[PDB]
Symmetry: D2
Subunit: 286 residues, 4 copies
């Protein structure tokens, strides 16, 4: 069991908004934290150097390409870990990248848990993330104190790859929930409804999620400070639509939502993905 007694050193590959917040809760729980970032808590110069001085590695990188850049190659992290140790990938990446990393870990004798999370920076702050993990039950159990420190609930989704897939499911719901809301608000405004009336009325209905009601209140205030930036939301939508095409599942609502989030990312990659509400308001004003 990867308690702070048995494995105190946790090294991060990637240390952005989400990862830095999980690190704080792991530091509080008794772990000693280190990190590597491509740009440059003690910092290590390469992924390999990071892995060579950690008991457990947590990966939090944006996409398949960043995962490959830090996992493999001359300075890659995987070859720096000891056999029997645990690699916990919390990144939102494709099923293909997940399978490649799992198999590379098996060759090196390292068990890779695909453990993406549901929740954004507010949930990371409060350690109320939901961990979505694929792997053998005994390997999930080894990581329990790490998952417990950063989250409020650990869902064992199935074997390797199951966490990645469950994350894609939840991302699609979140993305299309926002584009649905932005489009419906835009119709209402175009049809002459008072803006303050409309935003407040929608807070009162049962057909909007708590997450999206929070986004709607923020959008009433024009507040799109990044909790989950458009560039990352839109990437997650791209991953989901590629996976759904590989499985030959028709998903027209998700596909439409993806195109709306491409427009959102193009106009403002770094503000919150909910900025599409403002985008649609501007379309109907003009």
């Amino acid at each position: 069991i990867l308690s702070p007694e048995n494995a105190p050193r946790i090294g991060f590959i990637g240390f952005g908004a989400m990862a830095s917040r999980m690190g704080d809760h792991l530091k509080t729980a008794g772990y000693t934290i280190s990190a590597y970032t491509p740009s440059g808590v003690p910092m290590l110069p390469t992924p390999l150097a990071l892995a060579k001085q950690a008991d457990t590695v947590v990966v939090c990188v944006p996409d398949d390409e960043a995962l490959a850049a830090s996992m493999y190659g001359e300075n890659g992290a995987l070859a720096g870990m000891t056999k029997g140790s645990l690699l916990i990938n919390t990144s939102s990446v494709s099923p293909e990248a997940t399978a490649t990393l799992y198999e590379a870990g098996q060759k090196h004798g390292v068990v890779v848990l695909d453990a993406p999370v549901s929740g954004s920076t507010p949930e990371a702050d409060s350690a109320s993330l939901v961990i979505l993990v694929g792997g053998d039950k005994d390997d999930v159990a080894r990581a329990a104190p790490i998952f417990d420190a950063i989250g409020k609930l650990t869902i064992h989704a199935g074997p390797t790859g199951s966490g990645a897939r469950l994350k894609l499911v939840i991302n699609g719901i979140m993305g299309a929930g926002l584009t649905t809301l932005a489009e419906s608000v835009a119709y209402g405004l175009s049809a002459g409804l008072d803006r303050s009336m409309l935003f407040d009325a929608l807070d009162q209905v049962a057909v909007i999620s708590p997450h999206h009601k929070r986004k709607l209140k923020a959008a009433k205030d024009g507040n799109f400070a990044p909790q989950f930036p458009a560039r990352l939301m839109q990437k997650d939508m791209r991953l989901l639509l590629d996976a759904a095409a590989r499985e030959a599942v028709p998903v027209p609502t998700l596909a439409a939502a993806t195109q709306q989030l491409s427009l959102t990312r193009r106009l403002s990659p770094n503000e919150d993905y909910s900025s599409l509400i403002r985008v649609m308001e501007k379309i109907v004003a003009n």
Copy 2:
């Protein structure tokens, strides 16, 4: 002038299906005398005219524009039987064009027409948990307050005439596309090998699904699509929303995609709950043809 049971005891319904009869029950408990007309035939009246002649206030609950026009207009319609100064409350989900036509027809009869569709289904109608979405003048909305208070938990004054109809269209789009989004996401998860019970239970625990749609997901886990809101009506409501969005020239690609999925849903089962798309997508992924 307030439409309390004291001053306007007789509430006559045009249309009296699942939603309306539940509203009528609550208005009975609050002290009103309920009558109704239905095209198929609480005392019944044979025509909309006969209904309106013996009612103080008329409440309309019909499925679409065509049913509205058939019962409101003409020598035997409801408007011909109403008296100047009275109020007609339309709770139907109809187009902005139908709403404007009825408002102006009401004005020629001296009848104020409130467009007051509701948010909520049969469980909310049963518990008087409906949210009333009403367009009209502030003082006419005040006149109807005791009626709205008996059937719902909250009255949203959306603006002048037509505003309630428009707000209902907004909420319908959120509801319909929320379901198609959920059905498609579950379908991907199943196609990718996720265990069904795991997946359904996991989604009940996330913050990005509405309480309404979490209820639908739990029913779909059991294959239960007994109708609370049938596919044929949800799909009609999306048709109305997409027509209105086109008239306003607002691009709504997510809502448009959802509408087409609800056309498939209606074609395969018009009368089961609109959430049956979850089953439709499960069968596509299972290759259950």
Copy 3:
């Protein structure tokens, strides 16, 4: 029975770009042309006055609301027509408006042919129109000399309402053909392809229709002179999607195309509907 120049007088209800060009070809074929327009080459002050002095009436109005305005009432065209005459509606209207006019005609003893056309102002100019006609085969035969003068081919689509439905079919192919082309071009430009190269290359492939190749060449030139204005194309898509919803037929590609044509109309109602190509180039230029 046949309406050869037997019935020399043809009166038009509506006399815009399309109608005026069929007028010239009918005048060339030896008919006597008269017209009414809501705005105001003999011009008649009311639809009634037009119908009273014409043998056959041809209707070309933009939408359902305009059709009812000029067809019905004591000043409408039907009130001026004599039992046994033919009304030929070439307007692009809903199946419901078509049925309403057919039944109203029956009450006056007037057969209404729903005969919308495939082709735009260039085809009206050359009499290359394809006539899409619903009605009884004998009534279609009566109107043959009229249809021959304005077009190259008469398709008997079926009974009343069939012409209107076939026009909806063809409108959807046109509209979504353009949005498909605009989006594909937009991808190519966003990925760095030279604009002049790309427009010229696409003229060389077999998967674009002759109509849309002509629009692509015009779009290379920024030429969106209004052969078919965005406001009318988008209305036609609205009618198609309403009808498809009433028939409960899932049409996701047509539904997506409609939303792109809503944006097109919002930005420029009066330019050619192909201006979406320019709209998408502007999105890519960002």
Copy 4:
């Protein structure tokens, strides 16, 4: 320099399916010696063995993964190729795979032309392909006798990667043209229009491409013998949507078409991609 039969007589194929074999027949007639490696197995046993025996390598594989399996590693085609030669990739793959192969080629001193084609098996039969090629103009000129034998027109689309991108553009037009047509036909049938009237009327309008009119005529008769199978069309749409998302370009019509082609693939992966017309007819008929 120029890759005429005199200077470079041996053309080795990596992959040899419906289009590649038809390409090879035309290069045979032009005077080259054709050899081929296929994963199933004159055939050579490995891509390495194929490349060692050829003067020019032409690649025709279905996707990025097949391309990587056959180009890279000690048994791959690049390890058997000589500095100064040309690899011509006609495969419909991603911009990312194209860039990876170009850069790998550079390391071996091998110029990689990304030269996918517009046209299907009938056009490969008649050498009526349109070549869509990315690369330096001097390298395109080197390959001209090869392109001329298999096609009727070579479009130089720009530098490396430009051919792959132009192919994605054309794939989108083709895929969404078909889904548009299937949906419009479905509406017409649902609205009561006679089927033969409807198919015959659409053959006579100017808003359908010659390619899609050929598909429509075949669909009239229920004929979906594969010229371009649903599984490959749908893969091409997947690649286009991924690329459009990477470029952040909103393409809702193309995205909708892709979902319809996912259904088409699921129901029949191996029949012609135009079978969506039949799928939609069956939806409207309630089977």
